[PDB]
Amino acid sequence: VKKVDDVTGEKVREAFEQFLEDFSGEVEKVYRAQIEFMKIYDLNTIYIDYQHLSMRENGALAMAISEQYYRFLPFLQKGLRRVVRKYAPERVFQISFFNLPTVHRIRDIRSEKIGSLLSISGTVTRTSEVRPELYKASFTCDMCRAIVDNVEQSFKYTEPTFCPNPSCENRAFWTLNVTRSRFLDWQKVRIQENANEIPTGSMPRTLDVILRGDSVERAKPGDRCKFTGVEIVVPDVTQLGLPGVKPSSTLDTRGISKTLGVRDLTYKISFLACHVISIGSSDEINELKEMVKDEHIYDKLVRSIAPAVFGHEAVKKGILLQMLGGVHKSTVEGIKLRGDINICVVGDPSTSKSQFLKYVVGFAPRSVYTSGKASSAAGLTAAVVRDEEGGDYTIEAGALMLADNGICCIDEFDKMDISDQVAIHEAMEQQTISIAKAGIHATLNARTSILAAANPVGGRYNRKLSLRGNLNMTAPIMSRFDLFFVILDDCNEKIDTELASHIVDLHMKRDEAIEPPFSAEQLRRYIKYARTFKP
Amino acid sequence: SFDRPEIYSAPVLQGESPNDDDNTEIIKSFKNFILEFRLDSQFIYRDQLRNNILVKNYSLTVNMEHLIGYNEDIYKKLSDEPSDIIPLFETAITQVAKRISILSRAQSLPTFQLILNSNANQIPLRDLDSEHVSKIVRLSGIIISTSVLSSRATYLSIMCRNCRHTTSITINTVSLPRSCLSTIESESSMANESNIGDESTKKNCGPDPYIIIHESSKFIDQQFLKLQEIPELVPVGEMPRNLTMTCDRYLTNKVIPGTRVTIVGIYSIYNSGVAIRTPYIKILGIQSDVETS
Amino acid sequence: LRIIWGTNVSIQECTTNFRNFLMSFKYKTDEELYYIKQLNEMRELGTSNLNLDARNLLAYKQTEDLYHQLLNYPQEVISIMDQTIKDCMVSLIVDNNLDYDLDEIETKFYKVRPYNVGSCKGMRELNPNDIDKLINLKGLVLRSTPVIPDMKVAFFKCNVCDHTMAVEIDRGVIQEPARCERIDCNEPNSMSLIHNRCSFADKQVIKLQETPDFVPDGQTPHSISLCVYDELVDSCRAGDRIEVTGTFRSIPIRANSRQRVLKSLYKTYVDVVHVKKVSDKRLDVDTSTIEQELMQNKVDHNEVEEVRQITDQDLAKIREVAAREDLYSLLARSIAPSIYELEDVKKGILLQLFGGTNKTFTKGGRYRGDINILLCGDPSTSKSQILQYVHKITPRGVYTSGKGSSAVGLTAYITRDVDTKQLVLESGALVLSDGGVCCIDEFDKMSDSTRSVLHEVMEQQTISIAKAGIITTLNARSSILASANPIGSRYNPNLPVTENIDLPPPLLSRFDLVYLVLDKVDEKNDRELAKHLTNLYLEDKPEHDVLPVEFLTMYISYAKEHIHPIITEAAKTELVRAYVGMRKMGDSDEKRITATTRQLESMIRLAEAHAKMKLKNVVELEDVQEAVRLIRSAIKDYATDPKTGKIDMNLVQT
Amino acid sequence: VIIDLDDILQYQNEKFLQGTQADDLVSAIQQNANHFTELFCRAIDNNMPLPTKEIDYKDDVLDVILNQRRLRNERMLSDRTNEIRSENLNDALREVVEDETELFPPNLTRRYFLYFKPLSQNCARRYRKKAISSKPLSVRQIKGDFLGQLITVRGIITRVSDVKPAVEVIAYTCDQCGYEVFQEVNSRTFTPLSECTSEECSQNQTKGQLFMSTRASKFSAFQECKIQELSQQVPVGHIPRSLNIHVNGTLVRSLSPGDIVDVTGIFLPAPYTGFKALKAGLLTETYLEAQFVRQHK
Ligand SMILES: Nc1ncnc2c1ncn2[C@@H]1O[C@H](COP(=O)(O)OP(=O)(O)O)[C@@H](O)[C@H]1O
Ligand SMILES: [Mg+2]
Ligand SMILES: [Zn+2]
Ligand SMILES: [Zn+2]
Ligand SMILES: [Zn+2]
Ligand SMILES: [Zn+2]
């Protein structure tokens, strides 16, 4: 019995084979060289640029693949297999598209584009462990001891549909052999919608992302990544109870001699991705050497921090030297010596202490901002999510877990409760956070520098009292803050005139009236280089 | 302590166009044939149906020639698959008889029996073979043995010896239910309560829990016959062949051994080599040649 | 002739009457054919949806019955209307022989959206006999689920010959083939469903806080579920005030996910066909906060308009009204005509409504022109009527009290959905008000814990969350309008201001304007106020040089949309001079509200608002002078002693 | 329709005082109230005058459907009688016509609701009787001896539920045969039908798939309210108890929380719903079906 064929599928297969073979002032061809490279280094994946595919055949191939990637993926796989066999001597091969012309938001996904290839962006909230995934199972027939191999699953546990031999008339009676089947690595990742993309008056969305093969263990919680893959659907048992009419399926009973299997068709949109990249040397070593060879480099380094804030040089010289830290030392007896620097800025609500926090969070590489009263003990530290739908538990990072080896910003520090204060105390004393919830113990790393902004206890800083009498903190946390910058207001005609002129300049001129010695990228490069010296 | 909900229907719209090979059209066609067909400008079948109902004989005798004259498609259908077509014609007879009886009463019938007579060419008893299985045949021979009358059920009233749930069965190989039917039948909301009691133990009536209440049931007559080939034409050096025949209701006690008859019936099988079955005939009509006055 | 079973609709009569109404009806511009031009413009632009005012049908004599037919049997009538619209369209295009390119219109789809169904009695007043009728509702959006894929065509494959089928859904049921339709292959029950090859539509569910006009005795607020389909998804955001038209539905629900048993008591909801997002009693939404949503609306081919349309005559009238020399006083007097005098209070309210100019720095940075006002004074004045009026005039906002709120209740929380049985995130008061005005009454009764969260809102127009499962920063671009009562019984003028208000002195400096509503006894003013108040009971209905509310809202919305003032050096000099004056003047402590940089920011914002009014694009000396005068008058420093900080009851003018 | 028992008692006394015999309808209705509802319905459906107003575009949809159903009934009857007459095979003719033809049952053609109201103390006191149905009782006093009777309760309403549609008879349609199938429901849950059960589809070999049609279905407006004892009724040192009331039809929205009322209704049983391990025999739960409401203020 001959199997039906799709002429269009074979046409696309031939087109893709020709594309691989025929793509090219020393001329070169990239894809053949890359196949040779894969042979040399024993890899599993091929990287293909989208524009290279697009600029041919009047875009027919690019379109057909774009809106029917799901249909044509097996034919692309077959074409790649044929090309590699022809031009090179079990192996699972993966293709990786990237550099699409446009990017979509998580808020603008539609059921029309199901089964097509697109690109999305979001912030990673959670990742699970890598687990084996059933790919091509093997079964043993029961009525006869025949053996069936290379049975595909296709997103769910599938069984053979008929015994391969007429000697046995078995069907639906099978056993699974876990000894001679293959698996692939499988990971689940939860991403969140970007902060600047959330519309007015609405809470953020989330989307499940599935990773396979060598793309696993790439995303990291707290990072922004751009994905590319297919938009798929999976069952949603949770949709019962919603209003509306939900499709049901029943077997047609016309044409059957005579003389119940109804199913529900509820689904939800997920995303199976193939390429993941994070979004944040070269000629610039000359620039780095030129700039280090400056002699008043320190003055510019100080002046380029918080350029939009008038004065307060000491706070800037603290924020610097908080980005750059000491060195961590270990004693023979096992006593560890700290290398982090902590700062507290004290002032009344009428001062500009919060702008320093905002600058740090907007500038520093791994920084998190939080408020004293808009936080929680689980919001800081971490939680455990034992409802992992496929297996064992997982742990979700809190505020302190993020910005590890970075800086944590805490405004309204004087509103923290006792439990969260003890959590910060534990983080400062030892760089660890201990979790004891739901019968699960764990230990985490909390090597973080804390930048806090506190208000005086009475609203105004009574200069008759000492620092201890004007604060609300507890002795342990207060005894680890190595710098206390108390900023007060002095009435002076020239200072007031200068401040007013600067503010009016900023409103009238906007971006023009900034003129800092160095750019933010330059500062980041300098700090990245300088954090690796160990004086 | 609610009662049992009901279900009913009523016609409103006109569904798909009727097909020719559907049961309702077959019944309507047979009804038209019964009430319209004319011979010598006479309504033979309507008149004899009326007379029979007046006489309390619930049957019609019909000649196949008249039917093949009136309509050929249903004739071929009846010849090819009698087991499917006979009940349709019987229910048509009953439908007509209901109206006839009601109007006559103006000025509780059972299902009527269809008796088929024929005069086409017969077939020898030694010519029956596989090609004839389940078709209609016409045979000639001599009756050599009639049996005693048996009893078979046409309507049974049964009850469960555990929970006393009652039901009924109608016949027109039926067997009594293997399990009590009071669970699948969700009769009432309190019926759900009644199906559980005395702590944790489940309710299980057992295997074959039903019994027959004889004083409220109905039965019919049944008989067996043996047909042999005429002893004149048997080949030398061999004994004659014979066959087993079954008839019921109004075809019982019609002939006696030693009579030469023509039989119309269905060639069938039953289970009593490797895959062998025993043939026999389901009687549709008997025609006697007049013997031993 | 041939009616449809169950209904009384006749397809032929309905189509003929609809065609006749389409081809002959005028608004009695009132003498011309109203719908011919609308269809012509639709085809010129290529729009596919026609908005039908159901009230227009009651005017024509023929369609006096089609109105009730549409209200009773929307399902048949809407399809008949759509087909008739397409037929009338082809007739219009071909009968005049404009362009032979008519394939597109013959292939595309059309639709009609009723939007003026009669006045209803509230969702909870409907009876079972009202199922599958046309109704309308008013309410506030709370939540929306993500898009749900809803299958329409199923894709099967044969597991022996690769033959692939296609089945269309039929009233929510799929008929799976029981045998391959091939002659070579006839294997029974060999067809498998490949879900990723199916075609899906769009669906969403919205949670609505209904606001009926008539409320029976003892009825509390409740919520309703709305179903939107296809192009209308993502057309609503939490905090939006909307008017909706749809069908009243019902459905049974399964008892458990294992069995297929249903419950006798049904669940009700609404299917949406049209949404109105504009009104003549309130301002239009600030377009600076919906930048990407308008682009998405254009991409999605949804014909919902966010802002009201303007006719040329309206713009001409706007220009003439802006061209007069009494504009400021007239506009101030228009606000709340039922409130007597309070000239500077009303001026501050108007300036707050107009708002300052929003700067957006390239490479990061955001300044906003939201204006915050605090109302302090004698308890018995009219300082809560102001809050009520401003709440009812603004597009978005929540009216809260200090003592009846909480830090969590203002920001965000987690709740378990009663339908899906899962946990979801909801919004608080301050995020529901983003882009609007949040009114807080009795600000001095709010706890310090509760007050803590206002700092970030008023100092960066944002909020941060660090809770289990959620870590993000939210927009809170909302203005604050607060009120407070003095400590004790009455504002004592023999004490400083800081001894009369129960708030820390540092907090009072973060507002842009502070008002001291003092009550003085003068017989002339008493006579005036008494006569004003007693004139309101002369006749059972109100009859009180004031602009109408509709024109006022139109003018303010146009000014907010289309004018963006910019400051000049002439204003810079005066700004710096006045700021230095305030800092120096008054220089033994906690006797007065100390000047800060917030005061310079407030002058900038108020001058920008004054320029933005009256359709100017440049801020000049008069603007800054007026801003400084208003700031000084609000706190009435003219009657205050710079040394002791007391007030003279003889130097204050009513 | 409201049926007043005072009228029945007056009719009985009028019949008696002039000599002739009569039955005690009042007591029969009182002791077995749930059976007389359908008796009254059937009697009323036999006497309803023809409508003197034509049906126009400003009537309810339910009335339109009812009128269509009645016209269809008449058309089927006329077709059947004509077909039988044309056969050539008048009380008997109509009898046979009635035997062979389907129709729409009376319950699917009614448009009214029927309620009873109790015997007032005044009428019984004047006629020398004991009006049981209108002697107020507390929830404490209502025991199992009162099940199946028409009784009155005095109390204060504490909770009321929103009105929702409760389905009485579901409707389906068959595109194969064109019949309409009706499925009665009197339980808290039910199982939808799958395949057609009409005579035509039953006799054939290929049956059609039923589809549910909400507009033809029969619905009722349902509410459930709780009623609590008054302080003066509670014994010494005890806590007040409660009771359940069901309201159906046009009597909905007549009770709001906080009202002291005298509810009238038929006291009926319901299936047990407690823990399984504590079930000893055929235990039941009780509820009241409302028939009349009066307020103290
Ligand atoms: N200037 C005014 N114009 C109109 N009504 C006024 C005025 N002053 C006082 N009233 C009347 O006095 C009452 C003021 O009370 P209210 O405004 O509720 O107190 P507050 O707002 O100060 O808490 C209102 O009912 C209003 O009718
Ligand atoms: Mg007030
Ligand atoms: Zn086998
Ligand atoms: Zn039993
Ligand atoms: Zn096949
Ligand atoms: Zn049917």
Structure tokens at D192: 């939808």
B12 touches chain D (CB under 8 A): yes
D contact test, residue of B2, B6, B12, B98 with most D CBs within 10 A? B12
Q: Are residues A407 and A427 in the same domain?
A: yes
Task: For residue C67, give Cα distances in angstroms to A361, C24, C54, C57.
Answer: 61, 17, 7, 6
Using CA atoms, how far apart are residues A267 and B144, in angstroms rounded to an integer?
74
Q: Tokens 């019938």 label which residue?
A: B109
C-beta C525 within 6 A of ligand 1: no
Structure tokens at C113: 């959206």
φ/ψ of C412, rounded to 5, equals 180, 160
**Ligand nearest to C-alpha D197:** 6
Q: Are residues A229 and A162 in the same domain?
A: no
Nearest CA-CA partner of D119 in D291, D258, D297, D274: D291
Give the contacts of C268 (CB within 8 A, at least 6 positions apart). Answer: C248, C249, C250, D164, D165
Q: Are B141 and B253 in contact (CB under 8 A)?
A: no
Query: Which among A148, A168, A184 is the end of a domain?
Result: A184
Residue A109 sits in a domain whose CATH number is 2.40.50.140
Report helix, strand or coil for C85: helix
Minimum CA–CA partner of D206 in chain A: A254
Q: Which residues of D touch C250 (CB under 8 A)?
A: 165, 214, 219
Residue of minimum CA distance from atom 26 in ligand 1: C382
Ligand 1 atom closest to Cα of residue C342: 1
φ/ψ of C471, rounded to 5, equals -140, 105
Give the H or E element holding residue D241.
none
Q: What is the DSSP letter of D144?
A: G
Rg, chain B, Cα only: 24
- Within a domain: residue A246? no
Using CA atoms, how far apart are residues A116 and A227, in angstroms rounded to an integer?
14
Testing ligand 1's pocket by substitution, the residue of C376, C385, C489 carrying the most ligand atoms inside 8 A of its CB is C385
Q: Are A434 and A426 in contact (CB under 8 A)?
A: yes
Structure tokens at D135: 């002697």
Q: Which residues of D touch C69 (CB under 8 A)?
A: 57
DSSP per-residue codes, C547-613: --HHHHHHHHHHHHHH---EE-HHHHHHHHHHHHHHHHTT---SSS----HHHHHHHHHHHHHHHHG
Structure tokens at A277: 């990249």
Which residues in A126-158 are b (16+ Cβ under 10 Å) and which e? Answer: bbbeeeeebbebbbebeeeebebeebeeeeeee
Rg, chain D, Cα only: 24
Distance of CA D66 to the CA centre of its chain: 18
Q: Please give the annotated binding residues of A for ATP, written as ranges.
A: 347-354
Q: Which of residues 59-98 of D touch A (CB under 8 A)?
A: none
Q: Are D42 and D60 in contact (CB under 8 A)?
A: no
Question: How many Cβ atoms are within 10 Å of A295's Cβ, its own excluded?
Answer: 6
Q: Are residues A120 and A136 in the same domain?
A: no
Give the H or E element holding residue C45.
helix C34-45
The answer to whether D165 contacts C8, with C-beta atoms less than 8 Å apart, is no
Nearest CA-CA partner of D276 in A385, B196, A511, C147: B196
φ/ψ of C476, rounded to 5, equals -135, 45
Q: Are A204 and A122 in contact (CB under 8 A)?
A: no
Q: Are residues A389 and A532 in the same domain?
A: yes
Using CA atoms, how far apart are residues C593 and D260, in angstroms rounded to an integer?
59
Using CA atoms, how far apart are residues C200 and C145, in angstroms rounded to an integer?
17
Nearest CA-CA partner of B8 in D101, A504, A397: D101
Q: Are residues A87 and A145 in the same domain?
A: no
Residue A461: CA count within 13 A, CB half-sphere:
18
- Within a domain: residue A67? yes
Residue C165 Cα to ligand 3 middle (Å)? 29
Give the contacts of A55 (CB within 8 A, at least 6 positions apart). Answer: none
C-beta C654 within 6 A of ligand 1: no
Nearest CA-CA partner of B240 in B144, B121, B146, B147: B144
Using CA atoms, how far apart are residues C455 and C434, in angstroms rounded to an integer?
16
Give me the count of residues in chain D.
Answer: 297
Q: Are strands C470-475 and C462-467 parallel, antiparallel or unpaired?
A: antiparallel
Contacts 24+ apart (CB under 8 A), B229-237: B229/B124, B229/B125, B229/B126, B229/B141, B229/B142, B230/B140, B230/B141, B230/B142, B230/B260, B231/B142
CA atoms D203, D208, D210, D215: torsion sign:
negative
The answer to whether A379 contacts C466, with C-beta atoms less than 8 Å apart, is yes
Contacts 24+ apart (CB under 8 A), A102-109: A103/A226, A105/A193, A105/A194, A105/A197, A106/A191, A106/A193, A106/A197, A106/A205, A106/A207, A107/A193, A107/A197, A107/A198, A107/A199, A107/A205, A107/C234, A108/C234, A108/C296, A109/A207, A109/A231, A109/A269, A109/C147
Q: Are residues A216 and A180 in the same domain?
A: no
Count residue pairs from A and C with Cβ separation < 8 A. Answer: 285
Ligand 1 atom closest to Cα of residue C382: 17
Breaks (C-N over 2.5 A) in chain A follow: 24, 89, 259, 280
Structure tokens at A137: 């199972």
- Within a domain: residue A299? yes
C-beta C383 within 6 A of ligand 1: yes
Task: For residue A110, give Cα distances in angstroms to A235, A270, C294.
Answer: 17, 12, 17
Task: For residue D131, give Cα distances in angstroms to A97, D6, D126.
Answer: 88, 10, 11
Chains D and A touch (3+ CB pairs under 8 A): yes
The answer to whether C587 contacts A4, with C-beta atoms less than 8 Å apart, is no
Using CA atoms, how far apart are residues D69 and C558, in angstroms rounded to an integer?
59
Structure tokens at A59: 């875009």
Report helix, strand or coil for C188: strand
Q: Are residues A425 and A322 in the same domain?
A: yes
Using CA atoms, how far apart are residues A365 and A126, in angstroms rounded to an integer?
20
Chains A and B touch (3+ CB pairs under 8 A): no
Task: For residue B112, give Cα distances in angstroms to A60, B97, B173, C162, D185.
Answer: 73, 9, 21, 53, 38
Distance of CA D131 to the CA centre of its chain: 23
Using CA atoms, how far apart are residues A219 and A126, in angstroms rounded to an integer?
9
Using CA atoms, how far apart are residues C275 and C245, in angstroms rounded to an integer?
6
Q: Are residues A390 and A524 in the same domain?
A: yes
Nearest CA-CA partner of C359 in C610, C608, C602, C557: C608
Residue A84 sits in a domain whose CATH number is 3.30.1640.10
Written in H, E and C, the secondary structure of chain B is CCCCCCEEEEECCCCCCCCCCCHHHHHHHHHHHHHHCCCCCCCHHHHHHHHHHHHCCCEEEEEHHHHHHHCHHHHHHHHHCHHHHHHHHHHHHHHHHHHHHHHHHHCCCCCCEEEEECCCCCECHHHCCHHHCCCEEEEEEEEEEECCCEEEEEEEEEEECCCCCEEEEECCCCCCCCCCCCCCCCCCHHHHHHCCCCCCCCCCCCCCCEEECHHHCEEEEEEEEEEECCCCCCCCCCCCCEEEEEEEHHHCCCCCCCCEEEEEEEEEEECCCCCCCEEEEEEEEEEECCCCC
Written in H, E and C, the secondary structure of A228-255 is EEEEEEEECHHHCCCCCCCCEEEECCCC
Angle between helices A30-41 and A7-21 (to 10 degrees): 80
Task: For residue C284, give Cα distances in angstroms to C288, C368, C554, C558, D152.
Answer: 12, 18, 8, 9, 58
A contact test, residue of D164, D206, D213 with most A CBs within 10 A? D206
Q: Are residues A127 and A85 in the same domain?
A: no
Using CA atoms, how far apart are residues A196 and C474, in angstroms rounded to an integer?
9
Distance of CA B171 to the CA centre of its chain: 9
Ligand 1 atom closest to Cα of residue C383: 21
Q: Are D231 and D213 in contact (CB under 8 A)?
A: no
Resolution in A: 3.0
Using CA atoms, how far apart are residues A405 and A340, in angstroms rounded to an integer?
9
Which structural domain range is residue A139 located in? 132-184
Strand partners, C251: C267
Q: Are residues A214 and A273 in the same domain?
A: yes
Q: Are residues A329 and A397 in the same domain?
A: yes
Strand partners, C481: C373, C439
Using CA atoms, how far apart are residues C572 and A500, in angstroms rounded to an integer?
9
Strands in D54-130 per DSSP E: 115-117
Using CA atoms, how far apart are residues C555 and C354, in angstroms rounded to an integer?
10
Angle between helices A69-87 and A7-21 (to 10 degrees): 50
Question: How many Cβ atoms are within 10 Å of B54's Cβ, its own excluded?
Answer: 11
Using CA atoms, how far apart are residues C274 and C228, in angstroms rounded to an integer?
9
Using CA atoms, how far apart are residues C343 and C358, in angstroms rounded to an integer?
27
CA distance D134 to chain C (A): 29
Using CA atoms, how far apart are residues D161 and B129, in angstroms rounded to an integer?
77
Give the contacts of A216 (CB within 8 A, at least 6 positions apart). Answer: A130, A185, A186, A187
C-beta C535 within 6 A of ligand 1: no
Using CA atoms, how far apart are residues A462 and A458, in angstroms rounded to an integer?
8
A491 touches chain C (CB under 8 A): yes
Q: According to the annotation, is C288 in a ligand binding site?
A: no
Q: Tokens 């074979």 label which residue?
A: A10
D278 touches chain B (CB under 8 A): no
- Within a domain: residue A517? yes
Q: Which residues of C touch D164 (CB under 8 A)?
A: 265-268
Angle, vertex CA B232, rays to CA B226 and CA B236, nearest 5: 100
Rg, chain A, Cα only: 31
Residue D210 Cα to ligand 6 middle (Å)? 7
Testing ligand 1's pocket by substitution, the residue of C341, C374, C381, C485 carrying the most ligand atoms inside 8 A of its CB is C381
Residue of minimum CA distance from atom 10 in ligand 1: C382
The answer to whether A369 contacts C473, with C-beta atoms less than 8 Å apart, is yes
Count residue pairs from C and D with Cβ separation < 8 A. Answer: 77
CA atoms C549, C551, C555, C558: torsion sign:
positive
Structurally, chain A folds into a number of domains equal to 4
Minimum CA–CA partner of A369 in chain C: C464
Nearest CA-CA partner of C516 in C340, C345, C343: C345
C261 touches chain D (CB under 8 A): yes
φ/ψ of C105, rounded to 5, equals -70, -30
Q: Are C609 and C347 in contact (CB under 8 A)?
A: no
Structure tokens at B257: 């051994």
Residue C585 Cα to ligand 5 middle (Å)? 94
Distance of CA A25 to the CA centre of its chain: 40
Which residues in A6-29 are b (16+ Cβ under 10 Å) and which e? Answer: eeebeebbebbbebbeebeeeeee
Structure tokens at A412: 């309204």
CA atoms C389, C392, C397, C402: torsion sign:
positive
The percent of chain D in helix, strand and coil, each rounded to the nearest 5, is 35, 30, 40
The answer to whether D205 contacts B105, with C-beta atoms less than 8 Å apart, is no
Number of H helices and E strands in chain D, helices first, is 7, 11
Using CA atoms, how far apart are residues B140 and B124, in angstroms rounded to an integer?
7
Structure tokens at C495: 């004490």
Testing ligand 1's pocket by substitution, the residue of C338, C382, C401, C544 carrying the most ligand atoms inside 8 A of its CB is C382
Q: According to the annotation, is C502 in a ligand binding site?
A: no
Question: How many Cβ atoms are within 10 Å of A420's Cβ, its own excluded?
Answer: 22
Angle, vertex CA A185, rays to CA A179 and CA A188, nearest 5: 130
Contacts 24+ apart (CB under 8 A), B167-175: B172/B87, B172/B110, B172/B111
Q: Subunits touching C (CB < 8 Å, at least 3 pairs)? A: A, D
Q: Tokens 């459905």 label which residue?
A: C251
Q: Are C238 and C65 in contact (CB under 8 A)?
A: no
Question: How many Cβ atoms are within 10 Å of A63's Cβ, its own excluded?
Answer: 12
Using CA atoms, how far apart are residues C556 and B83, in angstroms rounded to an integer?
88
Q: Are residues A205 and A294 in the same domain?
A: no
**Cross-chain CB nearest to D187 (options B11, B189, B193):** B189
- Within a domain: residue A61? yes
Angle, vertex CA C639, rays to CA C633 and CA C643, nearest 5: 115
Residue A259 Cα to ligand 3 middle (Å)? 30
Residue C646: CA count within 13 A, CB half-sphere:
8
Q: What is the DSSP letter of A116?
A: S
Using CA atoms, how far apart are residues C268 and B154, in angstroms rounded to an integer?
52
The answer to whether B15 contacts D89, with C-beta atoms less than 8 Å apart, is no
CA distance B24 to chain D (A): 7
Residue of minimum CA distance from atom 14 in ligand 1: C382
Task: For residue A161, give Cα distances in angstroms to A169, A171, C189, D230.
Answer: 11, 6, 10, 70
Written in H, E and C, the secondary structure of A453-513 is EECCCCCCCCCCCCCHHHCCCCHHHHCCCCEEEECCCCCCHHHHHHHHHHHHHHHHHHHHC
Give the contacts of B80 (CB within 8 A, at least 6 positions apart). Answer: B135
Give the contacts of A329 (CB within 8 A, at least 6 positions apart). Answer: A336, A337, A339
φ/ψ of A435, rounded to 5, equals -110, 130
Q: Are A319 and A360 in contact (CB under 8 A)?
A: yes
- Within a domain: residue A256? no
Angle between helices C327-334 and C549-562 (to 10 degrees): 120
Strand partners, C249: C269
Ligand 1 atom closest to Cα of residue C339: 3
Q: Tokens 């062998």 label which residue?
A: B276
Question: How many Cβ atoms are within 10 Å of C176's Cβ, its own excluded?
Answer: 19
Give the contacts of C374 (CB within 8 A, at least 6 positions apart). Answer: C443, C482, C483, C484, C508, C511, C513, C514, C515
Residue A470 sits in a domain whose CATH number is 3.40.50.300
Which residues in A353-371 are b (16+ Cβ under 10 Å) and which e? Answer: bbbbbbbbbebbeebbbbb
Query: Which among A102, A117, A145 is the end of a domain?
Result: A102
Q: Are strands A483-486 and A343-346 parallel, antiparallel or unpaired?
A: parallel
Question: How many Cβ atoms are within 10 Å of A202's Cβ, its own excluded?
Answer: 23
Q: Which of residues 80-139 of B touch D (CB under 8 A)?
A: 96, 98-100, 102-103, 105-106
The answer to whether D205 contacts A254, with C-beta atoms less than 8 Å apart, is no
